[PDB]
Design a protein around this ligand. Structure first.
Ligand SMILES: *C(=O)[C@H](NC(=O)c1c(-c2ccccc2Cl)noc1C)[C@@H]1N[C@@H](C(=O)O)C(C)(C)S1
Length: 354
């Protein structure tokens, strides 16, 4: 009863949310997680991903100077009215390091344009990259039209999709993600605070990601926090009150850490099982996984976890290719399969040569 309890989810004062484990991908809690909503400033998480991907690929460096053009002139474009801005002016020569901090820390809309032109030649081309990454990540309820998150009529995303963009940032572009925890940066003599207030919350280790508000979106937050071996991502969209701003997301994260833990029962290349092989240069196949196994389970239940396996075929016949799928690993709690992973050949077995 204690051992098999399903914990109640706290009431969250928002249109939609999701809570996921970063490593396992497991959804711990959700409500209206696939409803299409105005992303507001959360759009900039994708802007930052594209930039992070360009930098990973070596297209430019943080020390590189970007010359500011007219479309990134903050007080030259009334579209930027009442919005977060670096106050760039044409002709300024600003290091990439400073513009990506303008975007990540400050949500500078002008810095988004500046980087979009620098990275991709035009804002349309850059939005095209954002949308190509939407497809590659397999996001089903997301579409961008703008580089900064301006309520543009046909852009949308979802709590699920925004958490997934969060996970992609941490996983694919860790050097870009490491910027999000920085509490401040200085530009043009002026000190600028990271807008993510949760970074200052002593009770959690929040290191990301992005807050947002436009008048169609409500209050929006994608947060990520760690506690030991465990990283959670929350996405809360259409938060109703100014006071629930960080509080509602904190509720989900603290609940997640209290009731769940992440286990890593198996790593790539390590033997889980061995099976006889026929016609081979060796007599036995070493079997395991081609991707690290992470599971999210109820907290405490780690020592109750059982693993077993099944095989696709009665017999293993060489040649066996490395990472050839030959079965399925079952992870179980209380005698019930909770998670499955493909069982694969770890070391190639070509046909015998004598
Ligand atoms: C993101 O949602 C908010 N940033 C804005 O700039 C903003 C816009 C906007 C206008 C032009 C281009 C893009 C955008 Cl998103 N329209 O309204 C706003 C407020 C930033 N997030 C909020 C917040 O979290 O409360 C601010 C710090 C006020 S600015």
């Amino acid at each position: 009863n204690i051992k098999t309890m399903i914990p109640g989810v706290p009431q969250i004062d928002a249109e939609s949310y999701i809570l996921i484990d970063y490593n396992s991908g497991k959804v711990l809690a959700e409500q209206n997680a696939d409803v299409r909503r105005d992303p507001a400033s959360l759009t900039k998480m994708m802007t930052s991903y594209v930039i992070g991907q360009a930098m990973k690929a070596g297209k430019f460096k943080e020390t590189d100077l970007v010359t500011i053009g007219n479309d990134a002139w903050a007080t030259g474009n009334p579209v930027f009215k009442g919005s977060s801005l670096m106050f760039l002016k044409p002709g300024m020569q600003v290091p990439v390091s400073q513009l990506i901090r303008g975007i990540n820390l400050q949500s500078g809309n002008d810095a988004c344009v500046a980087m979009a032109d620098f990275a991709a030649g035009s804002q349309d081309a850059f939005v095209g990259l954002m949308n190509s990454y939407v497809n590659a990540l397999g996001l089903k309820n997301t579409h961008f039209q703008t580089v900064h998150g301006l309520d543009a009529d046909g852009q949308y995303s979802s709590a699920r999709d925004m958490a997934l963009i969060g996970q992609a940032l941490i996983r694919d572009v860790p050097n870009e993600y490491s910027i999000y925890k920085e509490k401040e940066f200085t530009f043009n003599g002026i000190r600028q605070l990271n807008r993510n207030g949760l970074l200052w919350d002593n009770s959690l280790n929040v290191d990301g990601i992005k807050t947002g508000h436009t008048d169609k979106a409500g209050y929006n937050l994608v947060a990520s926090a760690t506690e030991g071996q465990m990283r959670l991502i929350s996405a809360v969209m259409g938060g109703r009150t100014f006071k629930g701003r960080e509080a509602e997301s904190k509720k989900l994260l603290t609940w997640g850490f209290r009731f769940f833990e992440t286990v890593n029962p198996l790593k790539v290349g390590k033997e889980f099982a061995s099976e006889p092989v026929w016609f081979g240069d060796s007599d036995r196949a070493s079997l395991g996984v081609d991707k690290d196994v992470y599971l999210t389970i109820p907290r405490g239940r780690m020592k109750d976890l059982k693993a077993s396996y099944v095989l696709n075929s009665s017999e293993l016949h060489a040649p066996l290719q490395k990472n050839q799928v030959v079965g399925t690993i079952n992870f179980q709690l209380d005698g019930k399969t909770i998670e499955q992973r493909p069982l694969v050949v770890l070391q190639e077995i070509p046909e015998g040569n004598f």
